[PDB]
Amino acid sequence: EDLRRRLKYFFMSPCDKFRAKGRKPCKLMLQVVKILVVTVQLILFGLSNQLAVTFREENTIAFRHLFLLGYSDGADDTFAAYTREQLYQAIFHAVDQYLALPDVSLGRYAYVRGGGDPWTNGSGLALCQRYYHRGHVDPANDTFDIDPMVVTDCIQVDPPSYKNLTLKFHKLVNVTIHFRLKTINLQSLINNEIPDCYTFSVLITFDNKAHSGRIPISLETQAHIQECKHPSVFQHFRLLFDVVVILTCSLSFLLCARSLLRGFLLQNEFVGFMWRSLWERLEFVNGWYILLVTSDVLTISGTIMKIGIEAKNLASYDVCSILLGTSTLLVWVGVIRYLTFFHNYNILIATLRVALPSVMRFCCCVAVIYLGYCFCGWIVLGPYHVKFRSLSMVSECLFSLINGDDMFVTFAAMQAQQGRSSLVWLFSQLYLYSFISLFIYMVLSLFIALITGAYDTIK
Amino acid sequence: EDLRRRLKYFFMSPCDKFRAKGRKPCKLMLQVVKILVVTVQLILFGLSNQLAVTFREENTIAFRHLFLLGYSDGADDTFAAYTREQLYQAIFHAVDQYLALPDVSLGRYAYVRGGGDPWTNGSGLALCQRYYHRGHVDPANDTFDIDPMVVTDCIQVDPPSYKNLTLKFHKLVNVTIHFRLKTINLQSLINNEIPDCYTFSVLITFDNKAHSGRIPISLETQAHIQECKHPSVFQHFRLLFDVVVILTCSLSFLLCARSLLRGFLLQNEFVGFMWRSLWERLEFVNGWYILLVTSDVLTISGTIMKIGIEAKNLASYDVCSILLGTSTLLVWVGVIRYLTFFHNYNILIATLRVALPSVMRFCCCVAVIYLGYCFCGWIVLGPYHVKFRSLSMVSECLFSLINGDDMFVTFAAMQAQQGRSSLVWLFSQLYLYSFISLFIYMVLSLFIALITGAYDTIK
Amino acid sequence: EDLRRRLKYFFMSPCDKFRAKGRKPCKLMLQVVKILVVTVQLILFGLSNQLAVTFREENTIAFRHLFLLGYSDGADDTFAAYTREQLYQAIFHAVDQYLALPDVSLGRYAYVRGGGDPWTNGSGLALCQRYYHRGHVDPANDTFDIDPMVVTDCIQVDPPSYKNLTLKFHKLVNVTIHFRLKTINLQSLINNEIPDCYTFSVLITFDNKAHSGRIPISLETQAHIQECKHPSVFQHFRLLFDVVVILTCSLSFLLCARSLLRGFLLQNEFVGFMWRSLWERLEFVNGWYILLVTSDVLTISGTIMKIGIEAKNLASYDVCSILLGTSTLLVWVGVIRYLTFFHNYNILIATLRVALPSVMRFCCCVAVIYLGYCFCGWIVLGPYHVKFRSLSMVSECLFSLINGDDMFVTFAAMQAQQGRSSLVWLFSQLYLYSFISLFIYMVLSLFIALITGAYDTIK
Amino acid sequence: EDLRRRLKYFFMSPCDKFRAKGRKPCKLMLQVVKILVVTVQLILFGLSNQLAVTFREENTIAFRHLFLLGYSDGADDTFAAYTREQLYQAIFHAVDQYLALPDVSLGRYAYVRGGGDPWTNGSGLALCQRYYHRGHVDPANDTFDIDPMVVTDCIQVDPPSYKNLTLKFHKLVNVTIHFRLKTINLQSLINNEIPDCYTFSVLITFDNKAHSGRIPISLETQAHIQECKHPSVFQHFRLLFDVVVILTCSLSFLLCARSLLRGFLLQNEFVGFMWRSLWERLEFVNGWYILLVTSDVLTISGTIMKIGIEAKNLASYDVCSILLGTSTLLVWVGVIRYLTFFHNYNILIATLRVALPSVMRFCCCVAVIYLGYCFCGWIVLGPYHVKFRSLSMVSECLFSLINGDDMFVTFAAMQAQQGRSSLVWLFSQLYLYSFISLFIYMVLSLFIALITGAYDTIK
Ligand SMILES: CCCCCCCCCCCCCCCCCC(=O)OC[C@H](COP(=O)([O-])OCC[N+](C)(C)C)OC(=O)CCCCCCCCCCCCCCCCC
Ligand SMILES: CCCCCCCCCCCCCCCCCC(=O)OC[C@H](COP(=O)([O-])OCC[N+](C)(C)C)OC(=O)CCCCCCCCCCCCCCCCC
Ligand SMILES: CCCCCCCCCCCCCCCCCC(=O)OC[C@H](COP(=O)([O-])OCC[N+](C)(C)C)OC(=O)CCCCCCCCCCCCCCCCC
Ligand SMILES: CCCCCCCC
Ligand SMILES: CCCCCCCC
Ligand SMILES: CCCCCCCC
Ligand SMILES: CCCCCCCC
Numbered sequence A, B, C, D: 001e002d003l004r005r006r007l008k009y010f011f012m013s014p015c016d017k018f019r020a021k022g023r024k025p026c027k028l029m030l031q032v033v034k035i036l037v038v039t040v041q042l043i044l045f046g047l048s049n050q051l052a053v054t055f056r057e058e059n060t061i062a063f064r065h066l067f068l069l070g071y072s073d074g075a076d077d078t079f080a081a082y083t084r085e086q087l088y089q090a091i092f093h094a095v096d097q098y099l100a101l102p103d104v105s106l107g108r109y110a111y112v113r114g115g116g117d118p119w120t121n122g123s124g125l126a127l128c129q130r131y132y133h134r135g136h137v138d139p140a141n142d143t144f145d146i147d148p149m150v151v152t153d154c155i156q157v158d159p160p161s162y163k164n165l166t167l168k169f170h171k172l173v174n175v176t177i178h179f180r181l182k183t184i185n186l187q188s189l190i191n192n193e194i195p196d197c198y199t200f201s202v203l204i205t206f207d208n209k210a211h212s213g214r215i216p217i218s219l220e221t222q223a224h225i226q227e228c229k230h231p232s233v234f235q236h237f238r239l240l241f242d243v244v245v246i247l248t249c250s251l252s253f254l255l256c257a258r259s260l261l262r263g264f265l266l267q268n269e270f271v272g273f274m275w276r277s278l279w280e281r282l283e284f285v286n287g288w289y290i291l292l293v294t295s296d297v298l299t300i301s302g303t304i305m306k307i308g309i310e311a312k313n314l315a316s317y318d319v320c321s322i323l324l325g326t327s328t329l330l331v332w333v334g335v336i337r338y339l340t341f342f343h344n345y346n347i348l349i350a351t352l353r354v355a356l357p358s359v360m361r362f363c364c365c366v367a368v369i370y371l372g373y374c375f376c377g378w379i380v381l382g383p384y385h386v387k388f389r390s391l392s393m394v395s396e397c398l399f400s401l402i403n404g405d406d407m408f409v410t411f412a413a414m415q416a417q418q419g420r421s422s423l424v425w426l427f428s429q430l431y432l433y434s435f436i437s438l439f440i441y442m443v444l445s446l447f448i449a450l451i452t453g454a455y456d457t458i459k
């Protein structure tokens, strides 16, 4: 009796419900307001996120130019030493620049002393060489006597004896330089924020693990952010905007939870009526509202993290950015729920609903072939091909090849081996040709055929 | 009675109308003449447009080589100073080259003195440093005391004391060098045109807003064009050609307006007959003729601007070029109006007419997803990914990815973060894979399906 | 009566004709032999073609390294002078290297003296500056007085006063250095060929036509090949192979001409029978045999040219290579004539036969849009975009964009103008987005739909 | 009678057979175990394969930096000498560095003396110049007198007179430097493996075969691996894992062979029953089991090779890697055999089975066109186009072009010839446009149509 009318009303559109019981669509206007405010909050956060990331990266580039002898932009991957004299000069240049920093640097840096290892108390720079405990290497007689246990020896340099360093080249594992520098991110002032205090931990590595006559040289930094002690800025909204976002998301969450509860109660009543199928029950679950509550939770968590970062209780910019960006994407996607009511505007969702199961079953069979190719390429071609170094990189290369991207350069990276390793080159030819042909012309064609057949069904 | 015959005649083809009432198709021959003359005028204008653009750009490159110490082509994005000595040397090199310009430069330049700020009367070069009013920075004690108000102090150099410049490095915001140079674009002589007089305003910036120990250095120019005073060229068509273009476009406009008026009158009579639907009225509007009158207006405006530029009353080359190029494109497109009469030649337009509404409705749903991805990528990945720096650049990157372009390099730009920021790298993996899969395999497939289904309908 | 049987036999396959009248298929075996021999001849010619091209290009690169001060590989497009001292040094370096060539060069070169202009009798090198007859340039007073007539003044240098060169910088149009060198292409010995004598005409240009303060510097060569005088090589097939190719092509031509004549006679008889439609007559014309006779003519012409080049009567390697390569492609394509008899192997040709007319009609409408875009892009974007410099380059860029290639870099080349010329940048955005959308999603889709519909018809 | 039931059981699924006769599916669990263990073995082998390849390549790069004067990374393709003084300096630098190696090198190398040619007994380095027996070259008189027989003259250098080298430049064919160095691959210690002893044979070539004034310089190495004599590593699983892989593959092979024999016997019985068609017999052959036995043979061979390499009996890393990688790919693909039983999961295989014959027939016709284009492009464009140098490279370029990849750069590589060789440039335009249009829009469309029509059939 009334159950039929109740269900019919439960599955009606906002305009239909307004016609029926004069219900005002507050959820829709809330969604529009949410899109606006969440996007604005994301951009406002992005300002400070960019400030932090830029400070870290620019300081690291400046360190590379200051401490690496003969360094130039774009040389990171090939920068290396090849003679004993070059290596000694690089090490001494790094240490001398560390000692001269106050007089030459464009930035203002403070020294850090002591702390844990590798620094002794009062020491600012640690210069450590690591070598085998016993190494006797005699290629002339085709012999060696090695105790592979690593011994670390190093020199402590106080900021304003290291020149007596003697490297044990034949059994040298690596050389490292460790030091910390303190600086202040003044640019924050442009965003009406109090500058933070940064500590950069700088590691310079001269790596000899390959014992190949080529020692690559690299510099890396780790940044630690902390609040400064009683700072002063002459004449030192966002909080209220964050509170507004929180209120909007809370109201949206409450309305969506109420709708889900109403749907659950109606589902229970209908099941009781029928009894007097899991899918027939899930038909009462509004997936869009589950997405909306997930988005609200994400947005509130991101806003709380953002408030904490602004208050200087936290410094996890990356997590906050990921939370807020994902929530913004979900908020933008959420409004399709209201287009679902009209067939002329619901082609994408209607087709995906029919296509997805067969697509998943197809992927079941395609994935094992894809993984076989991934592992084979990674292990066989990785030592020779710059695009096959790692499994994730192999997956990227194969996925791009399926889409027709970067094909000729992939083929050409192997041309160097046609004269050196002919068998590997021939294998790479067969591998690439077979993969491209199979996946572009057979697999992808059938995938698209499944999707277009589903569309033909729903149309 | 006669209304049926009149409407049938009104909807007939040029050949059919010639058969019926012996009407000569002057509009079609006018369209052909218009294509020829408008294209020729565009090319002729392009000659002088190229001359102007080349003068500006070549002078700017020469300035970069003259005034930037150690500059080389292709280094614009990374050119920077890293030590106090480097910065002082760059500043003094720029000023010294400015003073030596008459003796060393291959071009002939005249100095400009006085005028508004930043130059005092009689001064040719302004060397200005901008720093915080009060800056006390103490990273050693984790303290600072800042009044962020910017103070500008600068030295005036008369063209043929600046060597005493002392930079306040710890609170320095930036350094700028401003000067103006006058020159003459002699190359115009090859196009039988009188050379113009150019003033180049040159700004060299040493930017320290990030306070990161790396100060990027850049040079920019702004060009002002003016007529020279009583020039003399020994033995100093285009005007007549412009007048011909104007006459052709005016006649085309008159004929198209007459046709539109006739259609409007016939529409009114038919509506009156029926009365004794907005679409049923718009059926009488020839959209091709609206396009043609728009193209005629654009062409006449562009020709008037071109005449003014040739007379030296205007120098807005870019606006003129845009007007004339758009009008040329529209003129070329306009002749499809006559192919519309024959079905075997009207596949594209006939199919678009049926497909466009459903395509627009589909875009309604796709656009919110696209914008969500744009904002998320711009804010989360922009600090780390060179292709996500700006919203327009993000849109370009995503649009290219949809078309399969530049995929692997997009993936590879993030490989540097796999060791530094693992969470951001993982997010970028999920973001790129999900976007590419969704848009290439689901969205684009259904878009093409809509278009091909419309074609199946009209065929 | 007999006419039906005669026609049925005339349209039968080689196996069917062998069954009917025991006819041996000599044309087919001739085609196979032709493929083999023509391909082999192409490769054999390619050996000597490569030798000639390599000699020219390697000599030109060596000249660039010898005569251009500070030249390095890959700098051709940006190599330029920027100060008077740099230009003087480059000019004097080129002349000094010309004079020192016998002592420093790795190649063996002989000087050429006299001849026509610009060299006087006995002169090996001509150093010429071209300037305006009267040039008074006064940017300070915004005035000039120019007689644009070009005066050429130049110095003659005898191979082993030019140091007194005074350049008129303010009215200088360009500077050129002309000289000729003779050398011998010894590498020909590896191919059992007598070396040729080469004369390289070398032109070095310092171009100041833009009067922009930047003078680009370039070097170009023209090679003239001649037989040497009574050469001697101790112990100094291909001719017989060329004769064999000629005989094979002649026999194929004769058989195809006989077949065409037989078809023409049968066509005339059938028309006479019917009389007691142009297409109904062209149905008797074997297009494959027209292609075969064209290929035979091309092959014979190429072989005669190759024999002449080997005999040293000709040196037009490029024309011979084009003739032989085209003939090889046509010979390879010609064997599809025999697959046309079997439907399971004739899908491509059968479908093209049905699709081509509608494709041509579609192209009629698409071409005007494409040309409008070409002209608009060439004139509006060419001064700003490296990929739009020339009309052919614009066509290449747009054709590649239609196929999804190089999209993001096309967008990115304009990002530099977003700050300098905002209006041009906005126009480029609209231009690229509209072109890509229209052509990839609407035009190409309908093109493929036409082809697949034709296939659906023939299947 | 029983034959029908026997055949029906023979063609049932694992679950169906378990229902029928309670058969435990040991082959399927064996396949899962095989996937796991084979993939793990491949990765474990990849560790040592990477160690070997890295040692070889890093040593070669170090040699290039040590022995090539003025060498820098990325200069391999253009590195060349252009004056006699440069060539002498490069030769003497290489020899001097060879003599100074113990004092300057970061690696530890031992000299090799004597052996076969080109070294005499006691000699470590051979410096050999090769020139024509008689060369008189007179370009001034357009004459030459050559005996092309090559004479080799060379100097022996003992490791710690070559300075008196006099090069016969006008008839010089090339110069080579040969020497061998011994070293130890210590990095193996990180993988708990005993280091191997490497001998690097180093060849430095200064090539003058073109006699063009440009002499390219290159360095190449060949590595020979051997076990060292009585090495000692303080405290010097994989064997047991290899044995486990062998056992698993052997059991899988036995089960698959038993299944194939059972199928053969059933086939014979059915044929005997019918007698009282080759395809009707091949219907009894399980192709998946043939694939599985092939994979088992490959895996066992690869494992035996891996054990031999670990024992130091072999050093063929490339062959072992190819065997194991191919076997891993086949093992991953093999599990689709069990998905073949379910139609919803068998779309790919079911469609391929129907599409493959028509695809092969289509390829018959397409291949001759493709080969014609390959040969034409290789011979005509190869001397001018970097992507057409070799036939394999031409095939890669054309295959990539079909897939839309690298189009604009292919067009742009020819733009340099538009001014030099206009006829070749025009031919390249026609060649590229025709190939791309024909193959992308006609051939590929029909290929995809065949595949999708087969899918339409099986669905
Ligand atoms: C009945 C249905 C059942 C389910 C259907 C079948 C499911 C299909 C599963 C697909 C699996 C494909 C294999 C990918 C993994 C291979 C690469 C890999 O592991 O990377 C190594 C990397 C790490 O390896 P690495 O490179 O760091 O280490 C290599 C080792 N060294 C460094 C020592 C050399 O792992 C990853 O982080 C995973 C990256 C791959 C992820 C790509 C898969 C897609 C992700 C989801 C987005 C798509 C959503 C689409 C939805 C949109 C529309 C709604
Ligand atoms: C019932 C039907 C209703 C309508 C149907 C639905 C309409 C669909 C609307 C599409 C909108 C898609 C979103 C694009 C905007 C995102 C990018 C953006 O805003 O850029 C930022 C830029 C500016 O941002 P920015 O990068 O300068 O600033 C970033 C901020 N900083 C610098 C501080 C880091 O804005 C633009 O200039 C817009 C560029 C995007 C334009 C692309 C859209 C297409 C243009 C029209 C051409 C296509 C015509 C096709 C017709 C051919 C066939 C007839
Ligand atoms: C009824 C059916 C009958 C059969 C149907 C028709 C069969 C179709 C045959 C295709 C042939 C196509 C021509 C390619 C050869 C041209 C290039 C060449 O030879 O290279 C030169 C190279 C060597 O040349 P080079 O470049 O080293 O030498 C040039 C000379 N110098 C150096 C002096 C300048 O040869 C090769 O190594 C071959 C490379 C091409 C291989 C590509 C073909 C595909 C390989 C198989 C993988 C695909 C499997 C797909 C299955 C997946 C799904 C199940
Ligand atoms: C994201 C959940 C969508 C659920 C599909 C049903 C549409 C009402
Ligand atoms: C909704 C998940 C929130 C995760 C926050 C964790 C921050 C360390
Ligand atoms: C550009 C306007 C086209 C209007 C479509 C109707 C064709 C007669
Ligand atoms: C038809 C629009 C003309 C715009 C001209 C404006 C130039 C400043």
Ligand SMILES: CCCCCCCC
Pocket: C286, C287, C288, C291, C340
């Ligand atoms: C290349 C000419 C082909 C002619 C088509 C008819 C096929 C017998």
Ligand SMILES: CCCCCCCC
Pocket: D286, D287, D288, D291, D340, D353
């Ligand atoms: C790889 C062999 C597959 C054989 C096709 C038949 C499937 C049972």
